[PDB]
Amino acid sequence: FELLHAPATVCGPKKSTNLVKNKCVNFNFNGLKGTGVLTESNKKFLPFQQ
Amino acid sequence: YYVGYLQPRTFLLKYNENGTITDAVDCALDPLSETKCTLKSFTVEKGIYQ
């Protein structure tokens, strides 16, 4: 395998930590870095919008 | 069938509560569109603008 010469193609899924509600966490969602409190939402996203 | 070409410009787009694009306005077509883009609004009151 090789690193840092072409866009990523193949790799296995990463085991993730279970979601925690209503607690100060240092979240990292597929590239985002930030801090806050995660709760259930209400906004109706579009099918492709992330 | 129809073909058209693209060049880099700047647009002003209006979303809504659902999240869909409803209307858009150019910013380099007419002076009226220019001042609409400058004021960040779709309606302009009477007067002189820079």
> Could you tell me if A22 and A40 are in contact, meaning their C-beta atoms sit under 8 angstroms apart?
no
Whole-number Cα distances in Å, A43 to A22, A49, B18, B23: 18, 12, 9, 22
Chain A touched by B16 (CB under 8 Å)? no
Which approach determined this entry? cryo-EM
Chain A touched by B18 (CB under 8 Å)? yes
> Could you tell me if A25 and A32 are in contact, meaning their C-beta atoms sit under 8 angstroms apart?
no
- Of B13, B40, B8, nearest to B24 by C-alpha is B13
Q: What share of chain B is helix, strand, coil (3-state, %, to 5)?
A: 20, 15, 65
Q: How far, in Å, CA of B36 to CA of B50, rounded?
A: 11
Whole-number Cα distances in Å, A10 to A2, A14, A18, A30, A32: 11, 12, 24, 16, 21
Whole-number Cα distances in Å, B7 to B2, B4, B10, B31, B32: 17, 10, 10, 20, 21
Q: What is the resolution of this structure in A?
A: 3.4
Cα Dmax for chain A? 43
How big is chain B, counted in residues?
Answer: 50
Question: Which residue from A minimizes the CA distance to B20?
Answer: A46
Q: How far, in Å, CA of A3 to CA of A49, rounded?
A: 30
Contacts of A46 in chain B (CB under 8 A): 19-20
- Of B28, B50, B27, nearest to B42 by C-alpha is B27
Question: What letter would DSSP give residue B36?
Answer: H
Contacts of A44 in chain B (CB under 8 A): 18-19
